[PDB]
Amino acid sequence: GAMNSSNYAELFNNDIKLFVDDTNVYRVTVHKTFEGNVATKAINGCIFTLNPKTGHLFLKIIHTSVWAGQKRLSQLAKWKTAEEVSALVRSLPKEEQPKQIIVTRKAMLDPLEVHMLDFPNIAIRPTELRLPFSAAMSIDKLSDVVMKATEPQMVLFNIYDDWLDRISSYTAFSRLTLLLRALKTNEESAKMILLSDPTITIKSYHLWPSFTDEQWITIESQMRDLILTEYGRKYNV
Amino acid sequence: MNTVPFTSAPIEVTIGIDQYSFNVKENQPFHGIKDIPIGHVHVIHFQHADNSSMRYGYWFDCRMGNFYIQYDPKDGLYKMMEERDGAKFENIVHNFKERQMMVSYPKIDEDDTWYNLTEFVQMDKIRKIVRKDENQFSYVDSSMTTVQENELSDPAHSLNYTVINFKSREAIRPGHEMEDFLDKSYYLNTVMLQGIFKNSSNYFGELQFAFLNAMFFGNYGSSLQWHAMIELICSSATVPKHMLDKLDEILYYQIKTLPEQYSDILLNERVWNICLYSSFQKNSLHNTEKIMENKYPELL
Numbered sequence: 155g156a157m158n159s160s161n162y163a164e165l166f167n168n169d170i171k172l173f174v175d176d177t178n179v180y181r182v183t184v185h186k187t188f189e190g191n192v193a194t195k196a197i198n199g200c201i202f203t204l205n206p207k208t209g210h211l212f213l214k215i216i217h218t219s220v221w222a223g224q225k226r227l228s229q230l231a232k233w234k235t236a237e238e239v240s241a242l243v244r245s246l247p248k249e250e251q252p253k254q255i256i257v258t259r260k261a262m263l264d265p266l267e268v269h270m271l272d273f274p275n276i277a278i279r280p281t282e283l284r285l286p287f288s289a290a291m292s293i294d295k296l297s298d299v300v301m302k303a304t305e306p307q308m309v310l311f312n313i314y315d316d317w318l319d320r321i322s323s324y325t326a327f328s329r330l331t332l333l334l335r336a337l338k339t340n341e342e343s344a345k346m347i348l349l350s351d352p353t354i355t356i357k358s359y360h361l362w363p364s365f366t367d368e369q370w371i372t373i374e375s376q377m378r379d380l381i382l383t384e385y386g387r388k389y390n391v
Numbered sequence: 392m393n394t395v396p397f398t399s400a401p402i403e404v405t406i407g408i409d410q411y412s413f414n415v416k417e418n419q420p421f422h423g424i425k426d427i428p429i430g431h432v433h434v435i436h437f438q439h440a441d442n443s444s445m446r447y448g449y450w451f452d453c454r455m456g457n458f459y460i461q462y463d464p465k466d467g468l469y470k471m472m473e474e475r476d477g478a479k480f481e482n483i484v485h486n487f488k489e490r491q492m493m494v495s496y497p498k499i500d501e502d503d504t505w506y507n508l509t510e511f512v513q514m515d516k517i518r519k520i521v522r523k524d525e526n527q528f529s530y531v532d533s534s535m536t537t538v539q540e541n542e543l544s545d546p547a548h549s550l551n552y553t554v555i556n557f558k559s560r561e562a563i564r565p566g567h568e569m570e571d572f573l574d575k576s577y578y579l580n581t582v583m584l585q586g587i588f589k590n591s592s593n594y595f596g597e598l599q600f601a602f603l604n605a606m607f608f609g610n611y612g613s614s615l616q617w618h619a620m621i622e623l624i625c626s627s628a629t630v631p632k633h634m635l636d637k638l639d640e641i642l643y644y645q646i647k648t649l650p651e652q653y654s655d656i657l658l659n660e661r662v663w664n665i666c667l668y669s670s671f672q673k674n675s676l677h678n679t680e681k682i683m684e685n686k687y688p689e690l691l
């Protein structure tokens with residue numbers, strides 16, 4: 155069924171599973187026309203499909219050409235997401251196929267279920283977790299690949315860099331969600347925290363800086379302070 | 392006009408005949424129902440006074456044989472039987488008619504209600520939904536499950552309605568996932584009408600039979616089937632105009648006949664609101680929308 159805090163360790167067991175977040179698939183800027191009406195202009199998007207145990211991120215770049223001449227784009231975007239996730243599953247060897255796909259938004263349930271009818275043994279589930287995966291486009295290297303794309307493209311990343319050499323996937327996922335929540339809540343402040351120190355860099359093959367264990371504790375504390383600070387600003391607390 | 396003779400009425404029982412009903416007392420001198428209109432299927436149904444559990448009954452057509460009801464004290468119910476000896480049958484019916492031991496089917500001349508509810512219902516199709524080949528009539532009861540219910544348990548005692556499932560490979564062509572899920576026309580026209588039912592008359596017959604089993608027996612699986620067959624049409628962008636107009640008539644008479652006090656258990660709010668106000672056919676069922684809004688505005 156649905157996935158929440160009671161069955162949270164389930165994310166890190168040995169049953170292959172993927173989170174699918176469609177929040178960045180269909181992206182627009184809204185602007186006034188010469189006649190004073192309003193129009194949208196689509197910009198490139200992406201599907202965020204993540205294995206929370208391994209950190210493997212299947213980033214399908216959604217080029218704006220896929221919307222050309224199409225109607226009801228916000229509805230189409232859900233079905234396009236389901237089509238692409240289904241195509242990904244079919245492209246994987248059987249022993250790499252997920253046993254569960256967890257969608258971050260309940261509106262993805264029917265599109266994905268319908269596209270996956272050929273896979274009756276893959277459970278399609280919602281979650282009661284509020285996951286900050288919309289902030290994926292605040293990760294500079296992911297944003298760059300999405301905005302530079304001139305055609306549909308799939309790019310594979312490990313969103314945990316090399317952290318699993320030193321920490322469990324439970325801890326890695328917790329770190330990831332803290333970082334993304336901070337980037338979602340105050341992107342400039344979060345990026346300042348992550349990059350303020352010039353002596354700590356991002357390896358060419360990584361997404362995040364090369365913090366030592368003790369530095370990660372400091373960073374994590376600064377991110378929690380940011381989130382709490384923004385909560386106080388928001389609610390006048 | 393034909394007749395269904397009762398050996399006797401040893402237990403107090405409410406008897407239905409089509410949309411009519413009457414009470415018989417324990418051991419009352421009742422010997423059946425006369426003046427049954429030739430040309431339609433009929434249903435004779437029972438609810439015991441001392442045990443309202445199991446409504447049950449028999450669909451039949453007097454053109455297919457001579458049928459009589461006898462109470463079975465072992466199985467505890469009124470059973471329909473066929474009498475092969477026609478002269479015997481005529482002699483027994485004549486005696487009970489002469490002694491005025493029978494109720495008369497009370498059809499008003501103005502009244503097309505039963506025709507309107509059974510226009511497309513034929514005994515031959517009933518006997519394929521209800522499988523008991525040795526009898527020319529068909530037993531149904533409150534508790535019988537459908538083939539679809541038994542997939543989601545005795546298969547011999549099931550209602551073999553056509554399985555409709557909107558999230559099934561049958562309903563969704565590979566490569567047409569969004570199209571087929573949002574517009575059921577493929578599933579209605581190619582799979583169901585051209586493929587399974589062969590024509591709209593057979594589709595409407597099953598829909599009408601499902602409604603009648605829902606209403607007369609409180610059969611839950613039948614109510615599910617009726618709603619599914621409605622929703623399949625309403626959720627299709629492309630439906631022949633004659634089908635939409637006929638569906639409006641079919642539903643109008645069904646809603647007209649439904650007992651008001653059973654509307655909470657016989658009508659699915661989600662399906663009706665979707666069909667009348669959101670679906671492709673929201674503006675195609677003018678008669679049904681008008682009666683629904685005037686009779687059951689709470690549901691909407």
Ligand SMILES: CCOC(=O)C(=O)Nc1cccc(C)c1
Pocket residue numbers: 396397398399459461474479480483484
């Ligand atoms: C046990 C054999 O019994 C019968 O054959 C029988 O009851 N026939 C019948 C025919 C018409 C009317 C009624 C009331 C009975």
